[PDB]
Amino acid sequence: KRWDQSDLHISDQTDTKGTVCSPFALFAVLENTGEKLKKSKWKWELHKLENARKPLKDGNVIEKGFVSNQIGDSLYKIETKKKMKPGIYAFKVYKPAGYPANGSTFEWSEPMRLAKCD
């Protein structure tokens, strides 16, 4: 329940410009600009979206987890382990317990599109 003063922002995600054929794994990279991430849980969900109209709407959660895979001093990655199918997707990352009450309780990635190439 203690907030460790971490502040994670989505910095990048899979670039699906043009035709990216399913299956291809999706990811997001997050930078922590706050204090070191220790015990605060930053939940994430990969949503299969109805569409990419902003602001993004909750869809079907097909994978989930917590931000944990450290790739730099202040940098983390979330990614898929299940086989992807054609559709439109985005990661939704939730503020941890005790996070300040300014702004949203979540952050979405940009939408990512996987084509049907069969």
Residue 20 near residue 101 (C-beta atoms within 8 A): no
Residue 38 near residue 4 (C-beta atoms within 8 A): yes
The residues with which 78 forms a beta bridge, in sequence order, are 28
- Which tokens sit at 65? 């987890």
Technique used to solve these coordinates: X-ray
Q: Which residue has the tokens 């940098």?
A: 75
* Rounded distance between C-alpha atoms, residue 100 and residue 27, angstroms: 26
Residue 97 near residue 54 (C-beta atoms within 8 A): no
- Which tokens sit at 33? 């600009």
3-state secondary structure of 56: coil
Resolution (in Å) of the shown entry?
A: 1.1
